[PDB]
Amino acid sequence: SYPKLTGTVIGTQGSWNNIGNTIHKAFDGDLNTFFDGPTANGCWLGLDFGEGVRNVITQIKFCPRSGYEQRMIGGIFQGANKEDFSDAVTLFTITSLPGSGTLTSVDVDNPTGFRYVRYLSPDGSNGNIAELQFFGTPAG
Ligand SMILES: OC[C@H]1O[C@H](OC[C@H]2O[C@@H](O)[C@@H](O)[C@@H](O)[C@@H]2O)[C@H](O)[C@@H](O)[C@H]1O
């Protein structure tokens, strides 16, 4: 069991109806708060571990927005070493409805060290997700 990774929060700017449910609500430790993106499609969020830092990801945990769990199905998690994700690989694809109000934990088996990781939400989701966590270890 590896430590929770920290980094700078990156992703889609803004929030639905400018209420303020920005990407940062997915990293605040509260499963009742959530990211509600300004648009239906294209929303994403993640971390930049910082220049020169690469982690190997061994687990991802996430919790859907309460009452909108189906807006995660089809979302994917990617690791990359370019901030535009053009070199990304998909670490996990959500294909089952995530349980409400808890962190679903998924193992990742990819030995690559990444500087960047994200959740890329499916169309019609407004990026909805309540909490997102990555675990792993410094690439050796
Ligand atoms: O469409 C993104 C939006 O979906 C839900 O709100 C949908 C609509 O709900 C209606 O009943 C009205 O209240 C209207 O304001 C909305 O267009 C989510 O509740 C909302 O957070 C957002 O994710």
Ligand SMILES: [Ca+2]
């Ligand atoms: Ca939250």
